[PDB]
Design a protein around this nucleic acid. Structure first.
Lengths: 24, 155, 98, 78, 206, 127, 60
RNA sequence: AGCCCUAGCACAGGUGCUGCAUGGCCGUCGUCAGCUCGUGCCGUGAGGUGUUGGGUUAAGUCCCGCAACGAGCGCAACCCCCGCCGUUAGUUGCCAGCGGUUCGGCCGGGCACUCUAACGGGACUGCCCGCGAAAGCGGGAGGAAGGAGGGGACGACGUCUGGUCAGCAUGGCCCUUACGGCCUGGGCGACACACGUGCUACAAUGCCCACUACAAAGCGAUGCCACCCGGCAACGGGGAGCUAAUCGCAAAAAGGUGGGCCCAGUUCGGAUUGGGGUCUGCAACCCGACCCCAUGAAGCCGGAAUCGCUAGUAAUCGCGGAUCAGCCAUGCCGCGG
């Protein structure tokens, strides 16, 4: 989870944004 | 506990069967402070007790426990020689702690892939009396007796 | 209606020196929208107590910026009497706005 | 990894370019390992500082993309 | 290796800051540096006066600088002479025109930084450390104090081994907040290394 | 026509307005079971009523802010009690045995320096 | 080399970046709060004197 | 005259050595219930008594006793945070109470309530029963809170010749066309190995996608960036708002509901590597983080050992800040679910 950058939770944790976690 | 005798923490009764014992069991199931999913499992297991047997899930559960409470166990004690296991009678608080504990542990060893099922079958299996929860119970009663030679210490 | 703001590190000499803008615009003036306290903004400082390696054992400092708000609803110069130059702050700041 | 320019030391090309108008020099030597290699500025032989000395590296095509310090390693015993 | 600053402890009660100027979050850094360089200047070229505290207030180019001393006359001269140079010497580098109050101390044997400062002076004069301590406390205990304490660090009497000789009478309750304990700390740049002088004077309550 | 109390619990606060009638309960422009939807312990919040037999012969408009759901539930639970005794001050000497009238002081205790987490201490190693 | 370095911490540097903070009274490179230009050390020092306005001993 | 430039002279400089020459500040036993003094009394004397004893306490806390009677540095208390209540105050908060609502607390209207923050009230062993000579221990009501209600700040005489000359200060000793100084590169980032502290995991009480105000501290006008458009995204155009209870970082995540995966080294886990990019910066080879595609490792809960924690604690899930262009933060300091 928290270490796959291509998951939403991997992004949340990393604190970043993108395809797998876009900001609305 | 060098000072006092520790007031046993009193539990907020159940939101359904209004039973303190139930909640206790729900807590032992809970993982990382997720009481919601905890109680979902226990209740959604009470549902499996119905669809399979006539009896009320509570009186299943309740009497399922009483079959997993041990009456005797062994506590170690060394001396000026070696370590020996004196069989000790088991106090009412510890009985409940242990049965409920054992229940869940026993459950999560079972094969069926869904928490609610396992809790149910195990409860059910232990009401009948054939549970692997009840093995960990007969094993201690048997692990005393085997040391019956030493029940002249007792402290 | 007139807007003045008052910041300050000192909590006592604000409610005091802005109950001075209460009275000196109450005596010589009229109706008041009283002293209302905006929340405070605390700047924390956490520092290890030692000159050298002692990563535990630290001390704790804050810099709390209390904020107090005061407005009054009679823009007359029979109020800017004391509110001309009649001063007992010391390290309070003032924001006279429209 | 950049995209507006290629950020190569200007004092390097001046040597190179004005060495590229009939210029054959091999004693060319630099401390500009930070600077990207550039199109077909091949043939030359830039000695690069590794922090201790200069390294006679001959430049081919294929390595056009890379930077100069990728050929003057800075340590010993790998 | 324990024990807090008895002053730092009290700020907010018992003791108030020696800088009562509000500022903001990119000026504070500067009105700090000035504020300080001020006291680095005073304390060097005003030592002889005998300065305890150096209050300072600000409000866009009016600066309070209320210098408390036991012998004010040495900041002045006879009429103006010196203080006239110093209100200049302040504004000299400080691009702002300064004010400059002056205060006296009704008792310099209740001024911890002085009591400590005097004790130090004795020490570069090769004095009897044990006595100096016991005197200092005695003076301060007779200037009407409720309790008082003095510490020296070490190399006492030019010795090879660092020591720590101390003395106190009456209450010096560093653990009560309503204590009002002047604290003061002097050095002592001797021929063989530094010494360190803490001074404590306790006054009262509610 | 109207009775009221303030419920709080763990940085979570509840304006609780009681009325007699029907059985409906509003929370923040939502029905109860849409806000506390599929959260088992919600029904606890109304055990004050179930004690005194006020049951659902009351309506309640409740706004609430601060905390997370299960704090609010205990907060509401406190408002319901602090309101209905402000309807009948004789409705006290029966809510004492259940103690539905106590703020519940328990809150996040402070993280301390040199720990990790308040009590959780960092890991020893000896050698 | 602390001195030639404290009088280079002030110089306007070739290239913006090479700029760094410093204790004003330490000449200290590390842990220098922007708000004060002070090392964490020389800071606990002043805050205790009282020469740091409104800075209190934080307790909660 | 001031000030700058060359040759000279005093002197600068040194993160060079000495923490066993030191100041200062920290760590440590240990928040442990202790360490002492004055006068008297005892002893040739070092010393003792006091402070031993019984009851009691978290406590040398009190009580009762006693050749002692008191006192200081300690303990506790005076301070801060959190709980309940009350005044003061209304560009944050609502029909709770009524009219318009482009149904957004948005417009008058209003501070009752929530909140923001100043000052107060409140708990003391006060009251009833029980044992006790007492202090006090077991209960019981009243009360938001009951016996230290919970959490801080606070660290006695002193020990470790503890740490630190590399924060600073300082005795001494040592270099003074170099043990000083400036730059450009390189190094502190090496890698057969070994341990500490952590992080992410080994999955079904689980992972993935979709949709859904639970809102409790902080930061931001050479910055936070709404909202637009381009872009799979990083990010780049454009541009509103707020010196900020008003605008922005803001999505809180665990959760609830829907669908999907069906026990598999897997839709578990994301290491390694190929490639193509974005951004900050003079400059990312050594040595930056971020996006996207491809690659997908070891890992199926861990020997002998051994760590933390007693309640809003442990466990678990996000959140912010300090340093800071950027970031190797999984660290540290805090916050709440």
């Amino acid at each position: 989870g928290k270490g796959d950058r291509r998951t939403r939770r991997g992004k949340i944790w990393r604190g970043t944004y993108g395809k797998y976690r876009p900001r609305k | 506990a060098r000072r006092r005798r520790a007031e046993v923490r009193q539990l907020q009764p159940d939101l359904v069967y209004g039973d303190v014992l139930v909640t206790a069991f729900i807590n032992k199931i809970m993982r990382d402070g997720k009481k919601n999913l905890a109680a979902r499992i226990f209740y959604d297991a009470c549902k499996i007790i119905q669809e399979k047997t006539g009896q009320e899930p509570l009186k299943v559960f309740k009497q399922a426990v009483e079959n997993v409470k041990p009456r005797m166990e062994v506590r170690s004690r060394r001396v000026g020689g070696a370590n020996y296991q004196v069989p000790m009678e088991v106090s009412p608080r510890r009985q409940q702690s242990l049965a409920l504990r054992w229940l869940v542990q026993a459950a999560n060893q079972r094969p069926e892939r869904r928490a609610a099922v396992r809790i149910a079958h195990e409860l059910m299996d232990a009401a009948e009396g054939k549970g692997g929860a009840v093995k960990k119970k007969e094993d201690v009663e048997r692990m005393a007796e085997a040391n019956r030679a030493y029940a002249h210490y007792r402290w | 209606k007139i807007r003045i703001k008052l910041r300050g590190f000192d909590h006592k000499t604000l409610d005091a020196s802005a109950q001075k803008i209460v009275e000196a615009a109450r005596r010589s003036g009229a109706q008041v929208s009283g002293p209302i306290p905006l929340p405070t903004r605390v700047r924390r400082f956490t520092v290890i107590r030692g000159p050298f390696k002692h990563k535990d054992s630290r001390e704790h400092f804050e810099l709390r910026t209390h904020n107090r708000l005061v407005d009054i609803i009679n823009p007359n110069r029979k109020t800017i009497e004391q509110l001309m130059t009649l001063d007992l702050p010391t390290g309070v700041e003032i924001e006279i706005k429209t | 990894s950049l995209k507006k320019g290629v950020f190569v030391d200007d004092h390097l090309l001046e040597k190179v370019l004005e060495l590229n108008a009939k210029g054959e020099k091999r004693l060319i030597k630099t401390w500009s390992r930070r600077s990207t290699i550039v199109p077909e500025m091949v043939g030359h032989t830039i000695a690069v500082y590794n922090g201790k000395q200069h390294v006679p590296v001959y430049i081919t095509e294929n390595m056009v993309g890379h930077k100069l310090g990728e050929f003057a390693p800075t340590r010993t015993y790998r | 290796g324990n024990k807090i600053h008895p002053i730092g402890f009290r700020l907010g009660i018992t003791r108030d800051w020696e800088s009562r100027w509000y500022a903001g979050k990119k000026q504070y850094r500067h009105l700090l540096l000035e504020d300080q360089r001020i006291r680095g200047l005073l304390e060097k070229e005003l030592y002889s006066a005998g300065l305890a505290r150096v209050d300072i207030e600000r409000a866009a180019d009016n600066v309070a600088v209320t210098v408390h001393v036991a012998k004010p006359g040495v900041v002045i001269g006879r009429g103006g002479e010196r203080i006239r140079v110093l209100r200049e010497e302040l504004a000299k580098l400080t691009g702002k025109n300064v004010a400059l109050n002056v205060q006296e101390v009704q008792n310099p044997n209740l001024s911890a930084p002085l009591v400590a400062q005097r004790v130090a002076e004795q020490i570069e004069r090769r004095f009897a450390v044990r006595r100096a301590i016991k005197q200092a406390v005695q003076r301060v205990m007779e200037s009407g104090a409720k309790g008082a304490k003095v510490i020296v660090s070490g190399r006492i009497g030019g010795a090879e081994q660092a020591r720590t000789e101390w003395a106190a009478q009456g209450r010096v309750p560093l653990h009560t907040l309503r204590a009002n304990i002047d604290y003061g700390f002097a050095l002592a740049r001797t021929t063989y290394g530094v010494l360190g002088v803490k001074a404590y004077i306790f006054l009262g309550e509610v | 026509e109207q009775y009221y109390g303030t419920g709080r619990r763990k940085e979570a606060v509840a304006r609780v307005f009681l009325r007699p009638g029907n059985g409906k309960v509003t929370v923040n422009g939502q029905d109860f079971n849409e806000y506390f939807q599929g959260l088992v312990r919600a029904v606890a919040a109304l055990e004050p009523l179930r004690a005194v037999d006020a049951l659902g012969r009351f309506d309640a408009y409740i706004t609430v802010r601060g905390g997370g759901k299960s704090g609010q539930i205990d907060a509401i639970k406190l408002g319901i009690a602090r309101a209905l005794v402000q309807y009948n001050p004789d409705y006290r000497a029966k809510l004492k045995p259940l103690g539905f009238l106590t703020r519940d002081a328990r809150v996040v205790e402070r993280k301390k320096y040199g720990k990790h987490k308040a009590r959780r201490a960092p890991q020893y190693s000896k050698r | 080399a602390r001195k030639a370095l404290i009088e280079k911490a002030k110089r306007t540097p070739k290239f913006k970046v090479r700029a760094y903070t410093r204790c004003v009274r330490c000449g200290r490179a590390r842990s220098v709060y922007r708000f004060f230009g002070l090392c964490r050390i020389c800071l606990r020092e002043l805050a205790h004197k009282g020469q740091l306005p409104g800075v209190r001993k934080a307790s909660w």
